[PDB]
Amino acid sequence: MVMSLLGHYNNFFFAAHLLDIAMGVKTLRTILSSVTHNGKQLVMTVGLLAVVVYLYTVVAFNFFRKFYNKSEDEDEPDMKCDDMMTCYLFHMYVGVRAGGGIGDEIEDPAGDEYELYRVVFDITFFFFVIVILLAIIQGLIIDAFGELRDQQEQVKEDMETKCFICGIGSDYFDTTPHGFETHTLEEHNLANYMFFLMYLINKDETEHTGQESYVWKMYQERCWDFFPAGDCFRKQYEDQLS
Amino acid sequence: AESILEYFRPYLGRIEIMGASRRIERIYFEISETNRAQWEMPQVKESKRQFIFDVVNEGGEAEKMELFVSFCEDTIFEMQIAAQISEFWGELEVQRVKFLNYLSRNFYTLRFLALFLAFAINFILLFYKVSDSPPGNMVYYFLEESTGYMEPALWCLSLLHTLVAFLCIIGYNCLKVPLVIFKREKELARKLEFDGLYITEQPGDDDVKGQWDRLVLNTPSFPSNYWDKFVKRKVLDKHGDIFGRERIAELLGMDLASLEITAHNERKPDPPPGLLTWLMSIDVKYQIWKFGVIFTDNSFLYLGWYMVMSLLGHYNNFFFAAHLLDIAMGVKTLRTILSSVTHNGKQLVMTVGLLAVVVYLYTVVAFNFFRKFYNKSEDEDEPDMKCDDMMTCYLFHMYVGVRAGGGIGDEIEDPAGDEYELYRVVFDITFFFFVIVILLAIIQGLIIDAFGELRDQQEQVKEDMETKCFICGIGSDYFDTTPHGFETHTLEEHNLANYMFFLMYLINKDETEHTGQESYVWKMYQERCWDFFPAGDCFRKQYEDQLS
Ligand SMILES: Nc1ncnc2c1ncn2[C@@H]1O[C@H](COP(=O)(O)OP(=O)(O)CP(=O)(O)O)[C@@H](O)[C@H]1O
Numbered sequence: 103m104v105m106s107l108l109g110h111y112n113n114f115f116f117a118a119h120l121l122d123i124a125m126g127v128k129t130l131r132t133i134l135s136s137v138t139h140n141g142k143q144l145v146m147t148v149g150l151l152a153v154v155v156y157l158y159t160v161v162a163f164n165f166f167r168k169f170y171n172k173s174e175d176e177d178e179p180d181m182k183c184d185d186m187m188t189c190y191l192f193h194m195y196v197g198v199r200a201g202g203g204i205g206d207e208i209e210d211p212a213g214d215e216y217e218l219y220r221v222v223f224d225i226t227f228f229f230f231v232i233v234i235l236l237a238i239i240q241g242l243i244i245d246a247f248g249e250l251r252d253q254q255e256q257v258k259e260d261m262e263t264k265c266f267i268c269g270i271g272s273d274y275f276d277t278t279p280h281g282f283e284t285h286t287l288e289e290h291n292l293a294n295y296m297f298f299l300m301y302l303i304n305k306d307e308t309e310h311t312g313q314e315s316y317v318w319k320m321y322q323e324r325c326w327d328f329f330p331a332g333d334c335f336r337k338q339y340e341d342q343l344s
Numbered sequence: 345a346e347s348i349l350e351y352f353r354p355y356l357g358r359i360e361i362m363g364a365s366r367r368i369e370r371i372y373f374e375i376s377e378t379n380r381a382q383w384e385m386p387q388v389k390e391s392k393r394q395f396i397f398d399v400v401n402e403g404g405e406a407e408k409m410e411l412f413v414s415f416c417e418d419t420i421f422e423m424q425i426a427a428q429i430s431e432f433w434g435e436l437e438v439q440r441v442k443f444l445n446y447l448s449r450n451f452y453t454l455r456f457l458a459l460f461l462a463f464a465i466n467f468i469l470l471f472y473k474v475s476d477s478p479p480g481n482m483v484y485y486f487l488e489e490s491t492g493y494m495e496p497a498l499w500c501l502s503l504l505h506t507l508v509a510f511l512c513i514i515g516y517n518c519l520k521v522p523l524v525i526f527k528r529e530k531e532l533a534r535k536l537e538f539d540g541l542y543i544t545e546q547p548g549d550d551d552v553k554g555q556w557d558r559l560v561l562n563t564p565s566f567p568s569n570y571w572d573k574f575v576k577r578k579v580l581d582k583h584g585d586i587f588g589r590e591r592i593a594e595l596l597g598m599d600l601a602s603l604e605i606t607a608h609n610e611r612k613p614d615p616p617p618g619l620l621t622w623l624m625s626i627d628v629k630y631q632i633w634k635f636g637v638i639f640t641d642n643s644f645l646y647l648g649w650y651m652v653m654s655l656l657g658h659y660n661n662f663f664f665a666a667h668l669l670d671i672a673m674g675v676k677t678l679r680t681i682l683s684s685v686t687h688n689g690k691q692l693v694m695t696v697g698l699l700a701v702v703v704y705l706y707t708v709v710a711f712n713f714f715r716k717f718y719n720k721s722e723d724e725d726e727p728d729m730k731c732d733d734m735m736t737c738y739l740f741h742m743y744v745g746v747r748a749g750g751g752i753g754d755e756i757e758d759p760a761g762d763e764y765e766l767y768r769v770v771f772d773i774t775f776f777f778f779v780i781v782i783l784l785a786i787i788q789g790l791i792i793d794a795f796g797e798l799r800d801q802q803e804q805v806k807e808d809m810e811t812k813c814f815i816c817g818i819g820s821d822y823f824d825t826t827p828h829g830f831e832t833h834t835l836e837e838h839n840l841a842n843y844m845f846f847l848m849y850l851i852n853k854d855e856t857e858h859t860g861q862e863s864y865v866w867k868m869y870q871e872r873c874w875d876f877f878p879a880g881d882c883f884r885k886q887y888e889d890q891l892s
């Protein structure tokens with residue numbers, strides 16, 4: 103509402119509302135949930151990247167100050183790595199987005215002095231920043247997506263292979279034809295307990311059958327011993343056919 | 345008597361053993377308040393979680409009880425250390441003891457303080473410039489704009505960082521060095537008593553530990569941290585008949601073995617006066633062995649390297665930059681992130697080796713066939729030929745083609761010439777397909793497979809804990825017949841901490857009072873026999889005929 107009121111002032115304040123409402127889409131919510139799943143790992147990854155770039159910038163400032171000249175005109179005063187802050191800003195701006203390291207933007211290593219050291223520097227820059235630290239970011243998202251798939255599969259399997267009220271598996275109920283469906287529709291049904299609670303709440307204490315009054319007394323004391331919790335009607339009366 | 349039962353419920357412990365019959369027997373004992381308080385410490389819970397993870401993941405079905413007893417003994421030793429650190433020549437000695445106890449009590453807070461000092465040092469050292477002329481050949485000076493504040497400060501922080509590093513290395517020396525000494529002594533004593541590593545056989549080669557453990561055997565101060573001080577007599581009595589008594593006695597020190605027997609009673613020794621005696625009372629060989637054991641530990645070497653770099657940082661250089669990477673590994677989340685990369689380092693290094701072999705082969709092919717295209721100059725009469733030599737061509741390939749991302753054809757000349765056009769096109773296509781596409785996908789897939797591997801292992805460990813008993817062989821489905829039967833089984837009948845407190849009570853009690861069942865359990869523990877565990881049975885299954 104604040105942004106809607108500010109939009110009356112002649113500006114572009116109405117542009118953000120598109121991102122305000124697009125999160126409401128369910129499919130987009132499931133897509134964004136994987137990125138939101140491991141935000142902490144992402145921010146420590148960015149911190150580790152910043153530390154690595156700072157260390158490489160320090161090494162370049164100590165040893166490779168002469169190669170960070172980015173000018174073509176003679177008598178050039180444009181030295182990028184004369185200061186640590188400017189060199190760090192240049193590294194963070196260029197080397198991360200370069201995709202091939204710092205050697206593509208720095209001077210040629212064709213000089214005899216400090217050639218192998220600069221080659222090793224460029225190889226380590228390419229290997230440690232571009233290759234591994236982006237693969238970690240991709241693998242975090244892929245691991246999140248699969249983790250959400252495994253959790254959904256486990257939730258569905260738990261529903262299909264359990265009773266959620268009793269402790270008896272479906273293998274015992276599968277002796278009779280469609281025994282498990284009868285158990286999960288009539289003997290339990292959850293909605294049955296919901297409607298029983300509705301009937302107990304609607305009925306006044308004056309009118310409360312003995313069993314219903316006992317259930318109300320257990321509910322008032324917050325005692326959950328009225329649930330079967332590992333037993334059913336069939337197991338108690340297994341001697342008889344019913 | 346409900347109030348009596350509720351008052352003594354935390355102090356009452358139960359355990360189910362099997363001994364002296366073919367039936368399960370219950371033993372009730374007393375749990376101390378301080379042991380229960382020490383059990384609830386987060387470090388003890390983290391050690392327990394690590395032990396459970398190691399047992400479930402890599403530990404087999406067999407020998408689980410031996411690892412459980414070893415973990416229990418380590419927990420007892422940690423509790424003893426925490427009890428001892430808990431809080432004029434004599435005044436100076438008590439001040440030194442108090443300072444050592446204070447340093448031992450606060451160890452990780454000083455570590456975080458060292459991290460804060462390193463961050464402050466890096467933040468101050470951010471402002472640092474170089475100039476060709478001295479301020480007010482090239483010189484280095486900080487254009488901080490705040491005169492006289494940072495140059496003086498970073499020196500207070502340097503001295504404080506050195507002092508904190510020294511205090512942390514002292515705290516590590518007095519704190520966790522004792523556990524590894526106790527573990528090494530216990531392992532050596534058990535190997536000598538039960539395995540006969542030096543009595544029957546010999547660890548002649550492929551072990552640096554077997555050769556290094558020979559120095560402490562002859563020292564009279566062999567039992568220092570281990571509880572049993574009679575291991576040498578037990579070994580002598582065990583191997584006195586098969587092997588020569590004199591040889592086994594001489595190999596384990598034990599001078600004047602005949603005089604050790606109390607049948608003589610010739611004279612009683614007199615106490616020496618404790619002046620200057622401390623110089624002679626030390627054992628040089630034992631201290632050398634202990635120093636070698638300390639030098640063997642990885643964390644001691646890490647702290648020594650940290651202190652060396654801290655001392656070198658006083659010399660005006662940038663030696664303080666690496667400390668950020670030294671401490672950032674201590675973060676748990678960063679540790680779990682880096683563990684996936686550390687999980688498959690070997691596959692990565694053979695991948696780099698295969699990449700090097702492929703680049704060498706392609707460089708050889710280019711040198712044999714495509715030497716003319718590796719000219720990287722614009723000025724006429726160009727002597728800059730990259731692939732005139734095999735070493736220079738290999739260096740050029742390793743520098744350019746790997747980081748190019750599109751192959752060697754983007755940097756080499758144009759294939760528009762009629763001669764050797766299709767061969768160079770095929771060369772470029774194979775370079776792009778074999779290096780950039782597959783060999784980076786392998787690197788990414790290794791990390792993703794490591795992450796999936798760690799997720800599957802954690803899921804398996806948790807599922808094994810939820811679906812098993814970890815002591816008996818009965819699943820939770822049998823215990824789930826009664827309401828909350830599995831919770832009652834896993835809290836009262838087992839509980840692990842119950843066995844830990846039973847071991848505490850057995851250790852604290854002297855052999856004189858051991859009740860018959862407790863004496864039997866002590867006798868089985870002395871012989872290292874683990875048949876007192878149920879291992880597939882419980883109280884309910886034995887007495888299934890009755891309701892209780
Ligand atoms: N007491 C109970 N115990 C165990 N499962 C129960 C249950 N009550 C319902 N269910 C489970 O619900 C599962 C399927 O129902 P679901 O939750 O998918 O409903 P639904 O939203 O698809 C409506 P509909 O199926 O009529 O289109 C059944 O396999 C059953 O096991």
Ligand SMILES: Nc1ncnc2c1ncn2[C@@H]1O[C@H](COP(=O)(O)OP(=O)(O)CP(=O)(O)O)[C@@H](O)[C@H]1O
Pocket residue numbers: 389809810812813814815834835838839840
């Ligand atoms: N003897 C035993 N056998 C099998 N499982 C046991 C056990 N003793 C404890 N557990 C298992 O440990 C699990 C619970 O302990 P948990 O590891 O959650 O402790 P905790 O560190 O989280 C303290 P809290 O849960 O009270 O905050 C239970 O599932 C239980 O099965």
Ligand SMILES: [Mg+2]
Pocket residue numbers: none
């Ligand atoms: Mg799977």
Ligand SMILES: [Zn+2]
Pocket residue numbers: 265267268285289290334
């Ligand atoms: Zn049911």
Ligand SMILES: [Zn+2]
Pocket residue numbers: 813815816833838882
């Ligand atoms: Zn059990």
